[PDB]
Amino acid sequence: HCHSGEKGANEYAYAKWKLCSASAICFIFMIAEVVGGHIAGSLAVVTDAAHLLINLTSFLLSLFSLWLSSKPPSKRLTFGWHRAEILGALLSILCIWVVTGVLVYLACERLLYPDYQIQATVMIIVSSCAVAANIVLTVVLHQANASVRAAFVHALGNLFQSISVLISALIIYFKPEYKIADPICTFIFSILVLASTITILKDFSILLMEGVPKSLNYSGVKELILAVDGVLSVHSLHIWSLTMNQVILSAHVATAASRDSQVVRREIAKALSKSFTMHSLTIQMESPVDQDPDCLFCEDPCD
Amino acid sequence: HCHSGEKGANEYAYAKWKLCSASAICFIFMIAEVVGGHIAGSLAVVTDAAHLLINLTSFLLSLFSLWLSSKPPSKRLTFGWHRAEILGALLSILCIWVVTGVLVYLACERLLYPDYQIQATVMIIVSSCAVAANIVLTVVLHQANASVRAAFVHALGNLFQSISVLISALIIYFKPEYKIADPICTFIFSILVLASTITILKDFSILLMEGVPKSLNYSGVKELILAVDGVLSVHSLHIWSLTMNQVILSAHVATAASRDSQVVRREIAKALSKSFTMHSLTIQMESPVDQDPDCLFCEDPCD
Ligand SMILES: [Zn+2]
Ligand SMILES: [Zn+2]
Ligand SMILES: [Zn+2]
């Protein structure tokens, strides 16, 4: 019948906790260490307490993306609302890029305006919690689902940014004669952030461009299909992916003309669903006749 | 043979001119009206001459997206590099959102710091060219290809932003007693920008989520297919789209068991390619047997 029905359902549920819990943890931390600013110096933690609101924002946005992904397939969005996950993830990552650019420009400003001073010891304790809080905010998002993996890279990034004042603070406190080791620290650590976002960006860009999923390999799939009896030649094998774990596949095959078709494609479906989980298959089951010199449109992926 | 080979090839060529020409026009304008700043007041046009560089940047980025779209299909990117167009377009539009947010924040700053003054007559002539130049930069991008349509919305947006100082300038010159009609102008006109970007964003988001293309209609396609003789029931009709004009389709059909299959799907392909151009079709041609009460996974798009 070519439609097979808890292994997937439960996973949407786990992340839903791995985010709501992390969002709540960041909520607690932001609340506490902002009320610890009104009842003390009022320009102490707000600047750090800022970032925490950004992380919370990204976490709630990723959770919103999950809730969207839950929605059922419609007439307009046929396959379902799945890629909403990847979309929210890519939006969050571009927001990392934007926020980091903003921070780098403010660092350059502080450089061009060295007329500024901050007590280099209380500057550390405020950094330590920010590092510690980020340590916790990361280890909960330790990968997975495109949504959580987008929140982790978003969290880890803050960690490098978080120490980027601590490791700077110590160098300021232990030798305030320098005063210009902080901007270079923000620079290099923003670059580290950007490297991690480069990894995730490459992966989700390959996803959005209907690229074959990393988890698989095209020529391996052609071998795996052609390794079945009745077939003679498989042309136009396209295999893209939905968010992460919904691999689709669509192929033309040319089988033994006098052979019964439907058993051949049934066997192909069994072989494929045996090697790896699917989400749909539409094998066209063409005939022996094919205009081979003209199949250049479906000769093979050049690569 | 199910593979049919100048109607499409020439279109990549037209836009390639509709961008390179517009990029060059903006290049000319920026050059001229920046050298008209060194040889006069040096804080006159640079701020306007700034956004021209942003428009040029977006135009060259869209052209880069086109050049990517030209690349052939590979083993990793099976369908081809097509959606690179949509990706570059969405990036450019999010950059519109970012730049407009930046401008709105600087407007709020000018508000909270009314300690500032600018001659309200020379402020107009610098605005008029910016409006005129934007008038020209837009009417060349008058739509189409996802790349150009992304450059037009990007250009038109600057127009509203461009007059957003002129219409402000006049009100400053004709009554400098007000001095606070400029921020509200930037506000409302940024909102207009954001509305246009909302339209384009909705469309390309529907595209990226494998939504059926606007140009078509699902139930219309089911009627158009089921209107052919041999078929009995079509389930799991998925029809997404590549960038704009590469519509794909993939369907299971259940036809008369004793009937010859391949003629049925050949006729379906003829009917579809008759109603509207395609880019691929993989009709599975299932049998009469189907487990109807269990097809809930392929019952129909709820909507
Ligand atoms: Zn062919
Ligand atoms: Zn089916
Ligand atoms: Zn079914």
Residue numbers in the entry:
A (entry chain A), B (entry chain B): 52 to 56, 61 to 198, 210 to 369
Study authors write:
ZnT8, one of the 10 ZnTs that have been identified so far, is localized in the insulin secretory granules of pancreatic β cells and responsible for the accumulation of high level of zinc inside granules, which is required for the packing of insulin in the hexameric form. ZnT8 functions as a Zn2+/H+ exchanger. Our structural and functional analyses reveal a total of 4 Zn2+ binding sites in each subunit, including one primary site in the TMD (STM), one site at the interface between TMD and CTD (SIF), and two adjacent sites located in an open pocket of CTD covered by a HCH motif from the N-terminal segment of neighboring subunit (SCD1 and SCD2).
As the HsZnT8-DM sample was prepared in the absence of Zn2+, the bound Zn2+ ions likely come from the host cells for protein expression and appear to be integral part of the protein with high-affinity binding.
